[PDB]
Design a protein around this ligand. Structure first.
Ligand SMILES: CC(=O)N[C@@H]1[C@@H](O)[C@H](O)[C@@H](CO)O[C@H]1O
Ligand SMILES: *[C@@H]1O[C@H](CO)[C@@H](O)[C@H](O)[C@H]1NC(C)=O
Ligand SMILES: *[C@@H]1O[C@H](CO)[C@@H](O)[C@H](O)[C@H]1NC(C)=O
Ligand SMILES: *[C@@H]1O[C@H](CO)[C@@H](O)[C@H](O)[C@H]1NC(C)=O
Ligand SMILES: *[C@@H]1O[C@H](CO)[C@@H](O)[C@H](O)[C@H]1NC(C)=O
Ligand SMILES: *[C@@H]1O[C@H](CO)[C@@H](O)[C@H](O)[C@H]1NC(C)=O
Ligand SMILES: *[C@@H]1O[C@H](CO)[C@@H](O)[C@H](O)[C@H]1NC(C)=O
Ligand SMILES: [Cl-]
Lengths: 195, 596
């Protein structure tokens, strides 16, 4: 009702890498999800848990948001219960998460001429990322019998790789701004409820 | 301490880190071939230097991982290409001299002139001398005008090529090979698969068996051409015998298209020439390939991305830039697909556009495969796949459907005979010369013949199966095969031989599913969505799986045959047999023209 984050979380200038998403806890607010249609012609609005028809009249305790910048082929990978290279090493969603997923294309801003190197995505990781888990500190991956000794070389590589972004890539490799909205239930007097 | 996850992670890092260095290296070449000047060549070389070193240093670390412990087949298939090195195997001297020799051969082929006429007429090899060869009608003129290339450039290039043979014989054997022929033939070997195994020694037998079933058609065409040339040029070319080396249009005899004017089946009638129907009815350059995209959509194939109509150059520069344009279709990398071509309103540009769009769609088909497998199944698939659809788009049924031909038009027998012979003059005129050249190259790389008899055997055993005679002898002082550009620059020649067979099998296999009843030389593939799906099944396969599996997927027969090729030219053979009733087919190699 008074500058709710549902718009000020989309119009941010600089976003974060896929492995350091800026989670935001949404405080007391009214859940007008039909005004988001006035922010850009979204590319993806399909969302699971609850059908969009019933979302007009609903109420929950607290809502959390996450922000990324991702490619095009990996937009379908953010769906719950999927396997891949980014959906299991950087951001995993719970199987029965009752939230909604929104992603829109941003190539006229996120991609500069002569390449833009400000985003990253991890590739090497020993274990498997459990649902809703984060890790930012990097360590030289050990892929050999010889210890890494804190340096690279044989069998010791660097996990993070810069997302190559150019203004001439095909639709597949265009940067796509992604925001994930999930609903939480508690045993307290609820705060956010739709009108 | 895993033994295969190490290879998997190394390959993953290579795949994920070799794309940035390659896309921006290819973009530099693209910008070079759009405005040639001082800065553009500098940028192209600067971007290529950043990738040459990376590729030379990644192989040294990929070689450590063994090819025996690895088990997953798609891992060994990728690792085998990177394990294999190149010229970075010989010592310092044998490479710093080999590179110099290669550059010298390129330079000495580039530079060349002759002075037959008055001193002021020092016509270079191109384009005036090529034009006068492909247009004149004489004997002394051609002889005394092109005795120069085989007696000056050949003399220039004898010793360097003689040294090159022995310098590169001891280059393949470093990489576990018998001779350079094995290295050349290794592009087709696939092992480690049950029931799909094709050794190098099998390809020789396959080629020698394939060439045996095309001899009757070539003999009949040779007899027809000789009979016509006796009439055209009098007092020369004995009625029974072999053709002279010159006088056949092109110098090296690769193509026979320039003799179409000399040998026409039925005169006083016009062939199909859809160039005024495109002129009176206004038709610009954009629609020329817009309608081709429409056809590709009609065969049920994906559209063309928007990243193609904004930046790709498709017409004359028209803005002061200097560029040499030849029809190509680049694949820049991550999602980019561009075509550069100078377009003019004729059939040639239309068919060329069809070819380039077909093979760029082939390139786009396997975009999901990793970087090391973003290629055709073998080196001959791209050209054949592109040419299939150019051939299919040349039919009068498709031309009539598009509206370019008069509705009230009936295809006469004479016109279809002329069309068949026009295709034959260019298709079957290269097969026995290509096989000749490749056989001589292989047999001289294996060292079967001594180095003291290099041209004598060449001429003697070319007069047998090509049946082309040469005026005046050459006593090991004239390096004759050096005149070709492919031989001088060390380019493969087998691809041209197998491309025709592959495309002619593909055409029949594709048009059998399209459910066309009738002749094969007027068959058309349009509005055939199921046939398009059948073709896309092969196109999307990529190089992950061995090319013979792709052959079985698209056709169903492992080996390659000429019966599909002979099906196309059956009416031509039937007509030519009736035409030749008082002539003697054969090229008995007894007579010679150098009898003074
Ligand atoms: C045959 C040709 O080239 N053009 C004809 C000619 O009668 C004129 O130029 C015009 C009349 O509509 O167009 C048509
Ligand atoms: C994280 O959120 C805080 C509060 O909105 C914001 O000030 C900060 O800049 C955010 N991080 C990024 C990547 O902008
Ligand atoms: C984002 O900010 C700009 C500047 O205030 C504004 O013009 C635009 O409407 C905002 N985005 C939305 C909500 O479409
Ligand atoms: C010609 O060269 C210039 C160099 O400044 C560069 O823009 C490009 O290569 C060419 N420009 C055009 C408009 O073709
Ligand atoms: C080889 O590894 C790939 C993954 O890189 C896998 O998809 C494939 O199934 C493996 N090969 C076999 C025969 O399972
Ligand atoms: C494909 O079908 C359309 C249907 O209108 C037809 O107009 C067109 O000529 C067909 N293409 C052919 C026969 O090549
Ligand atoms: C073409 O076929 C017709 C069919 O009657 C025949 O009369 C004519 O002689 C043929 N022309 C040839 C074979 O050149
Ligand atoms: Cl010759």
């Amino acid at each position: 009702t008074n500058l709710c984050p549902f718009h000020e979380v989309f119009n941010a200038t600089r976003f974060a890498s896929v492995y350091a998403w800026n989670r935001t806890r949404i405080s007391n607010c009214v859940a007008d999800y039909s005004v988001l249609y006035n922010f850009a012609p979204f590319f993806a609005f399909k969302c699971y848990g609850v059908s969009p028809t019933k979302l007009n009249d609903l109420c929950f305790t607290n809502v959390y948001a996450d922000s990324f910048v991702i490619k095009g082929n990996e937009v379908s990978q953010i769906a719950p219960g999927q396997t891949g290279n980014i959906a299991d090493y950087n951001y995993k969603l719970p199987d029965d998460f009752t939230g909604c997923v929104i992603a829109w294309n941003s190539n006229k801003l996120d991609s500069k001429h002569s390449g833009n190197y400000d985003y990253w995505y991890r590739l090497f990781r020993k274990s498997k990322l459990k649902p809703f888990e984060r890790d930012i500190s990097t360590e030289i991956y050990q892929a050999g019998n010889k210890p890494c000794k804190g340096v690279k070389g044989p069998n010791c590589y660097f996990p993070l790789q810069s997302y190559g972004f150019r203004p001439t890539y095909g639709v597949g490799h265009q940067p796509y701004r992604v925001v994930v909205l999930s609903f939480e239930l508690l045993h307290a007097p609820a705060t956010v409820c739709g009108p | 301490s895993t033994t295969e996850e190490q290879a998997k992670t190394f390959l993953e890092k290579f795949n994920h880190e070799a794309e940035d260095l390659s896309y921006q290296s290819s973009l530099a070449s693209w910008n070079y071939n759009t405005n040639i000047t001082d800065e553009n060549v500098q940028k192209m070389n600067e971007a290529r230097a950043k990738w040459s070193a990376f590729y030379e240093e990644q192989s040294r670390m990929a070689k450590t991982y063994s090819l025996e412990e690895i088990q997953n087949l798609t891992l060994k298939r990728q690792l085998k290409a990177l394990q294999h090195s190149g010229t970075s195997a010989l010592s310092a001297e044998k490479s710093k001299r080999l590179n110099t020799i290669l550059n010298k051969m390129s330079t000495i082929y580039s530079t060349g002139k002759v002075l037959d006429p008055n001193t002021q007429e020092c016509l270079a090899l191109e384009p005036g001398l090529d034009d006068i060869m492909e247009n004149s009608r004489d004997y002394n003129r051609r002889l005394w005008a092109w005795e120069g290339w085989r007696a000056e450039v050949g003399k220039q290039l004898r010793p360097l090529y003689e040294e090159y043979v022995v310098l590169e014989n001891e280059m393949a054997r470093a990489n576990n090979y018998e001779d350079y022929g094995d290295y050349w033939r290794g592009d087709y070997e696939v092992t480690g698969a049950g029931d799909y195994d094709y050794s190098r020694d099998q390809l020789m037998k396959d080629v020698e068996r394939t060439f045996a079933e095309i001899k009757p058609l070539y003999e009949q065409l040779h007899a027809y051409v000789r009979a016509k040339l006796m009439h055209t040029y009098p007092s020369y070319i004995s009625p029974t015998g072999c053709l002279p080396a010159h006088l056949l249009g092109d110098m090296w005899g690769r193509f026979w298209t320039n003799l179409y004017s000399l040998t026409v089946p039925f005169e006083h009638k016009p062939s199909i020439d859809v160039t005024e129907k495109m002129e009176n009815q206004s038709w610009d350059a954009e629609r020329i390939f817009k309608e081709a995209e429409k056809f590709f959509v009609s065969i049920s194939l994906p559209y063309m991305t928007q990243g193609f109509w904004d930046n790709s150059m498709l017409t004359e520069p028209g803005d002061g830039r200097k560029v040499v344009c030849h029809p190509t279709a680049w694949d820049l990398g991550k999602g980019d697909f561009r075509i550069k071509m100078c377009t003019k309103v004729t059939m040639d540009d239309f068919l060329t556009a069809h070819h380039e769009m077909g093979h760029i769609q082939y390139d786009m088909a396997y975009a999901a495969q990793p970087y090391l497998l973003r290629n055709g199944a073998n080196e001959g698939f791209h050209e054949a796949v592109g040419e299939i659809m150019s051939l299919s788009a040349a039919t009068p049924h498709y031309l009539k459907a598009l509206g370019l031909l008069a509705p009230d038009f009936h295809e006469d027998n004479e016109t279809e005979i002329n069309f068949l012979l026009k295709q034959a003059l260019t298709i079957v005129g290269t097969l026995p010369f290509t096989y000749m050249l490749e056989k001589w190259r292989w047999m001289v790389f294996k060292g079967e013949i001594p180095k003291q008899q290099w041209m004598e055997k060449w001429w003697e055993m070319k007069r047998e199966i090509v049946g082309v005679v040469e005026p005046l002898p050459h006593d090991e002082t004239y390096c004759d095969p050096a005149c070709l550009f492919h031989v001088a620059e060390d380019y493969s020649f087998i691809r041209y031989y197998t491309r025709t067979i592959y495309q002619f099998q593909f055409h029949e296999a594709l048009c059998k599913t399209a459910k066309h009843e009738g002749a094969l030389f007027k068959c058309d593939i349009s509005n055939s969505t199921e046939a398009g799906q059948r073709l896309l099944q092969m196109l999307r396969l990529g190089k992950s799986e061995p090319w013979t599996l792709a052959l079985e997927n698209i056709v169903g027969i492992k080996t390659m045959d000429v019966k599909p090729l002979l099906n196309y030219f059956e009416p031509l053979f039937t007509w030519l047999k009736e035409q030749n009733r008082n002539s003697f087919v054969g090229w008995s190699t007894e007579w010679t023209p150098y009898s003074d």
